[PDB]
# Entry
Amino acid sequence: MSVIQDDYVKQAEQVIRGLPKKNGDFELTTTQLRVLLSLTAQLFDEAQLSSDQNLSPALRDKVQYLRVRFVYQAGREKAVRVFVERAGLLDELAQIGDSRDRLLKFCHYMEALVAYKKFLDPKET
Amino acid sequence: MSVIQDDYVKQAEQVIRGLPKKNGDFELTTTQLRVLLSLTAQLFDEAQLSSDQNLSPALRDKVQYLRVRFVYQAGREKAVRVFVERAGLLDELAQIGDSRDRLLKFCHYMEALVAYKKFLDPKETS
Amino acid sequence: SVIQDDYVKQAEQVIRGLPKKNGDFELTTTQLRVLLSLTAQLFDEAQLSSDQNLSPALRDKVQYLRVRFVYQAGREKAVRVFVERAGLLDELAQIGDSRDRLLKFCHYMEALVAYKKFLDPKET
Amino acid sequence: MNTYLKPFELTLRCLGPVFIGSGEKRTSKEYHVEGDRVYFPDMELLYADIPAHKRKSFEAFVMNTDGAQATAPLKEWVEPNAVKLDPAKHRGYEVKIGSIEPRRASRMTRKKLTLNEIHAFIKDPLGRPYVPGSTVKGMLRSIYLQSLVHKRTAQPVRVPGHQTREHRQYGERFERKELRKSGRPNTRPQDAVNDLFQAIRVTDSPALRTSDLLICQKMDMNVHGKPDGLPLFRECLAPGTSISHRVVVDTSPTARGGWREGERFLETLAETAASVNQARYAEYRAMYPGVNAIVGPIVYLGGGAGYRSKTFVTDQDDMAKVLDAQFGKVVKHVDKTRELRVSPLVLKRTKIDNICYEMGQCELSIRRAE
Amino acid sequence: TTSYAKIEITGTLTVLTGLQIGAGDGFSAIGAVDKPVVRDPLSRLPMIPGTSLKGKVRTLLSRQYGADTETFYRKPNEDHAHIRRLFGDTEEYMTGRLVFRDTKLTNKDDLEARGAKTLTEVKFENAINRVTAKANLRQMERVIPGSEFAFSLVYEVSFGTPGEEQKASLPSSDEIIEDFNAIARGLKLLELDYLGGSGTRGYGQVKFSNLKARAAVGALDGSLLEKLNHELAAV
Amino acid sequence: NEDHAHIRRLFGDTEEYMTGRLVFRDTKLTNKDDLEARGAKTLTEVKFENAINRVTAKANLRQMERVIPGSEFAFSLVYE
# Structure
């Protein structure tokens, strides 16, 4: 019951090409997601060095906090709300109960949406 | 004891959905909780830096002031009155006592209610 | 001394025992807004002060507060049952010159107007 | 003045006593009389000089628990143990009493009342009396709201119904129709930003002195001309004091938050005050005997002025159904107002032992001073 | 002009009828009125925030210039070139030239020297009905009419923001007179108005006294400071 | 890089005076316990400002946070 279609690079291109543009550019920039791309790097570098097949309760604690920080950021921003509901990130964060393998697929799918975000439009240098 | 359940993020989603409507747009705003959210953040920044599992007497008299500002704020607003009763914030504040990890448990549950309040509500988002 | 250590628990039982008419709570929160604006300024200068013993000016202001609790409870039947049940005229005689007796009194006083609005309708 | 803001000078000369209440009522255990003049000492200065062995008795005397039956004056307690009420040690103020009269045949038993309670005038934070600007602007919202309804109207105003809830909802829609005429571009037409009385700024009055504030009594004359002295003694003003306010009009265009015709209304302010005088309460005042009709630029201000001064109802039988929707189990007003054709049934007249005149009358004048 | 300068304009602001700026609305004390006033967060003194003082004078000046030219200025950046010069905008004059300040109460000891007990009074008001008159109550808090505030603002004389297509220059000494003339014209309009609050019901009448200019940094042109003190002489 | 020769030898540029002679430092709040003894419940106040539309006379509220007056920071600056 995942949103990832086992390719996740075509799917990460089917999201950024469908984002609602404005008169000039996209309504979503990458400076609005810096607080969420900094918390997802701490989950990647912690779950990678773990040898177990299920998450530690100290590692499972900071997935609930990333789940709450996504809801708060999507609540006070219109462009982040239309981006979270398009990719399917808040429904996927409730699928990671304690699986290390389903947490690593989220971090691969997260940075395929950032790579095409820098590429598909200017004003990202 | 323990009016906050584990997996509190699922408990906070059902609290905000169970609020009165008043023509769609909610009766409760986050501006009515502004004097309360600025005191819980000061309490969370002082309990986190501590180390002992028992609260200092300079920290246990800021919990008693916080649970007397909740009662006064729920008395003169009817939108805040039902939200305090629906979430059980006065019963948890009386049962904190002196432990460090029933105060940090209260503040993590407090963040999830404000996070779901801005998400499930239009006439917001600026 | 009458004020306990956990003053919030005993300030709630005072409000539950106030007298009531066919409605409830004949004493309102507008009948003592001239007593609440004098208490809320004694709390400010006592907090900003640094010395432990009170000033001579910080005793003429406490002594003026005690003549207003009798001049307002005299001309009001609802107020004088509240002052005698909460014991506000007994506590103001204990504060001779100690600062922490004042701040413990002003914390207990503002825990009475918290449960005065919460334990009834008719106040917004 | 200014090239877009035009001020005026509103001067009010009181012909009778004026009482603007503060919400304060003093009991007989605070003052004590001396002949006619009643002395009001400072409450803390007469307590500080009293030694500590009698302070537990002074607290049990003001807070009336036992002993006195809540009617004893200050001289009941202070006369045995003689603490001298000195006007120098207790810097208060002393002032006189207008009159005192009994009732008529109420039991004949000739009862004689005293001054048990006194209502207080509204004062400055220093202690001097003054007149608020929220009271005079509420009078001008009755002069303009009667000149558009006593001169001419589409229909003569009839209050529809019997319950007091539909008597309430008729008044809050007549004002909202006749005064929400600004027409802002994108708003509700009955919003508070469309009110025409946002272009009139009525400031407060300067602080007067407490040397002239006598104590009156509410005397209710009837059609036979026989007043009774109610126990409603209150600290009023006295005829002779001049109150001077400042009114500023704003000559910005309409829907920008202005009113160009409120200035034209303020230049004919003594005229509409005389035209509303002859049509509302000059014929009602002439019914009661012993009352001489004045033409005047007469307005009414403050409490004790009657039901007629605070409304815009015209017909006398129209005033009785709304008064019987809140009262009626005490005194039947509907049957009594069609026997002698008066509404209300009394007239709030006073006495200072010399001349019987009304309660709350004033003399109005204005000029366009820069 | 000839050099860089900063001009300091000091004075005194005294309150004639009771002032209620009232931008607390919830943050204030627990034993307080429904609509409280702005206080200092440490010393609990009543204050004037300086944003209300700047926005009121810009609103009164946009109606004085909008009645002499017969146009309605719909929003800022559409104002006059004399209001957008000393107050800021976001189009071509990007910064102010005028720095307002927050102002605490100063004569606290002079008020307790007289017979004043609380720094703020509590006033009860009424709302009567024009038929079968019944009334509902509200309580208002406002600063007492003896208070005095230490008014001050700074004025800067420099190049400013010249824009991408222009040649930068300093404002001449004839232009500093027209800037100071519009300040004292905008301070005489405030003495007729009410500086925040109810205002039309008698609140906030205010008065200016002892307005004088200095030269805090750098010298002036010469016989120029005394004719800036003459524009401020008529308030 | 176009500034005065007395500014570029103190603060530095990238053409002639490569590094400045002055080292600024970050400062933190020092008198926290002094402010808590005098009655500060929080170290920052929240100020409610309000923009008024000139046509409809409506209200556009906003919330601003700022450090309270009386706060005191330790200042340090090195010269070489």
